[PDB]
């Protein structure tokens, strides 16, 4: 019904207004502290070194930022190697798109447009195939019995695909307990902020991350699909009663 | 069948090996030219300004990088907040749509905790809204088709003129981006990839930011409904 579309739209709209209010309250006080610090650090540099013009500083800051955006760290004296470029391709296909590395060339951006257009539906067919095999394994008072088993599969999945890999990330990458879970959640939800990326020590570390992404993504999507299928059947019985 | 799962897996794996080979061939020669340029630009700066020690340069280069990671641009004297009433609302929508640009991200301890829970409950909320918009779009598509693969090309081409071509014109004139950069932003956005290399309302209208999220909402629910209508026929076929 169209009435439920406007209702769901309003709920989504107020959820963004609510979330936005909380995000501002947590991040904006810190954002102001970071804005004051860089402004002070630049004003001190120009005062200590009378040889460097404020525009000459801006020109070098821009060169450092340009090199950072491209992937080369200005600090110190490859992201496109056989394995890292393969992982980048997988990052595009999985709709994660971290953004730490991105196609800077003219031809790379054209190829990436076409690569995503044809590559994302190719991955969807693979996710469908893995979800069908996972659904058969998952299958192996009446409405609450089916929902009780759904809680069991969701909790167990959060110990194997969420808790277990976060332990590995905390010991390998040296990240905090929260940063290790935050990476797992943002990765599995295909959000891909890029603030934390696996492999920033071992050659088997990069292929084990994409395999975790492949199995972990196809497990939680299949649970949401098998639950959404039962919810569609329950919505038919709920529409006939009310 | 499980035979088709292993076959699709092998096709996906060779597609990443193929794509990875092309990406390296296009990006790695430029990556080497960017590495040599920053090294040269730093060696020239230290030679022209004998007052700045190479470590004093590295200290400031680190401060500039640190501010960029936090979200504040070191370039400029205005160091335009990313967490204002509208920009924070747009960030929330960026999380829900699984786009996650990454230009701005929750740096605080509490912000990361709230973001974990916000995505957990928020992504399935948007999925129900996408399902609702896809059902209304499917009824319009069914009536437009009546007036099977030939009609699918007609709906896909028309959608690329309104949701892809038309907004890219607006981005090229408002943001001042190139013709390719305007399409690349649209494609990366609507595919929920969200690289974050290009974002709406970058750095300098009140209606601009809410019109971007509405374009994301209608543009996402149109192409997903077209792919699901095809996927309905693929399940039967």
């Amino acid at each position, epitope marked *: 019904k169209w009435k439920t579309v406007v209702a769901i739209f309003v709920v989504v709209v107020v959820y963004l207004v609510t979330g936005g209010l909380v995000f501002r309250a947590l991040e904006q006080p810190f954002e102001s502290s970071q804005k004051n610090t860089i402004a002070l650090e*630049k*004003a*001190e*540099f*120009l*005062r*200590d*070194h*009378v*040889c*460097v*013009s*404020p525009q000459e500083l801006e020109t070098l800051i821009q060169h450092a930022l340009d090199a950072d955006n491209a992937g080369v760290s200005p600090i110190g004296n490859s992201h496109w190697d056989l394995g890292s470029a393969f992982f980048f391709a997988g990052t595009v296909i999985t709709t994660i798109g971290y953004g730490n590395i991105a196609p800077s060339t003219e031809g790379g951006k054209i190829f990436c447009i076409l690569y995503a257009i044809f590559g994302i539906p190719l991955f969807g067919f693979l996710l469908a195939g893995i979800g069908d095999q996972l659904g058969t394994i998952f299958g192996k008072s009446q409405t609450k019995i089916r929902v009780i088993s759904t809680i069991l599969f969701i909790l167990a999945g959060c110990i194997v695909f969420v808790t277990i890999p976060a332990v590995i990330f905390k010991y390998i990458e040296g990240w905090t307990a929260l940063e290790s879970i935050y990476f797992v959640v943002v990765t599995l939800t295909t959000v891909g902020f890029g603030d934390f990326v696996a492999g920033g020590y071992r050659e088997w570390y990069k292929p084990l991350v994409w395999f975790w992404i492949l199995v972990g993504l196809a497990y939680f999507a299949a649970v949401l699909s098998m639950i959404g299928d039962w919810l569609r059947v329950l919505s038919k019985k709920t529409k006939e009663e009310v | 069948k499980w035979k088709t799962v292993v076959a699709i897996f092998v096709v996906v794996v060779v597609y990443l090996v193929t794509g990875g080979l092309v990406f390296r061939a296009l990006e790695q020669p430029f990556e080497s030219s960017q590495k040599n340029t920053i090294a040269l630009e730093k060696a020239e700066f230290l030679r022209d300004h*004998v*007052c700045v020690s190479p470590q004093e340069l590295e200290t400031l280069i680190q401060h500039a990088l640190d501010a960029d990671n936090a979200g504040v641009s070191p370039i400029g004297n205005s160091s335009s907040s990313h967490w204002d009433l509208g920009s924070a609302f747009f960030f929330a929508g960026t999380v829900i749509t699984t786009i996650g640009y990454g230009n701005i991200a929750p740096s605080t301890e509490g912000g990361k905790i709230f973001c974990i829970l916000y995505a957990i409950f928020g992504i399935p909320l948007f999925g129900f809204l996408l399902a609702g918009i896809g059902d209304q779009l499917g009824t319009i598509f069914g009536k437009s088709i009546a007036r099977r693969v030939i009609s699918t090309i007609l709906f896909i081409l028309a959608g690329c003129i309104v949701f892809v071509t038309i907004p890219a014109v607006i981005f090229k004139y408002i943001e001042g981006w190139t013709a390719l950069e305007s399409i690349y932003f649209v494609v990366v956005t609507l595919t929920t990839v969200g690289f974050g290399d290009f974002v709406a309302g970058g750095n300098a209208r009140e209606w601009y930011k809410p019109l971007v999220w509405f374009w994301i909402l209608v543009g996402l629910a149109y192409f997903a409904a077209v792919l699901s209508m095809i996927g309905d026929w693929l399940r039967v076929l």
Partner: nanobody
Framework: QLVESGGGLVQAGGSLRLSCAAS????????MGWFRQAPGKEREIVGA????????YYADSVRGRVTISRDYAQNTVYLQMNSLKPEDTAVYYC???????????????????WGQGTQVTVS
């Protein structure tokens, strides 16, 4: 507070020795400099020097002739412009912006503390 001493008439090819003492109790540290306002032109930068005096700057108009000195014990900057040209006839002001805005432009339109200015004429 920036008090100056050294202006006056000087023959062509001679030397100009200017001074500028900072009587202000600003214990934060400030970069000092010298500027000149030409009769028909705008204000131009002559040179600059850091608070400690470890690094100096000279404009392209006078880089091979001038020398910005500094007595840190008495908080005073000095200017010794040798082999003077007629083009050097201007009012010489000393500046001191401890917020990084001394070098902002060639005129010093963002300078915090300005001197009294001394008239210099080259025959």
């Amino acid at each position: 507070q920036l008090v100056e001493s050294g202006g006056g008439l000087v023959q062509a090819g001679g030397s100009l020795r200017l001074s500028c003492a900072a009587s202000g109790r600003a214990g934060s540290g400030y970069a000092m400099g010298w500027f000149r306002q030409a009769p028909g032109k705008e204000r131009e930068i002559v040179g600059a020097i850091s608070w400690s005096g470890d690094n100096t700057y000279y404009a392209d108009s006078v880089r091979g002739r001038v020398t910005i000195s500094r007595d840190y014990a008495q908080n005073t900057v000095y200017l010794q412009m040798n082999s003077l040209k007629p083009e050097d006839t201007a009012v010489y002001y000393c500046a001191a912006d401890g917020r990084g805005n001394l070098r902002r432009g060639t005129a010093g339109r963002y300078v915090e503390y300005w001197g009294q200015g001394t008239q210099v004429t080259v025959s």
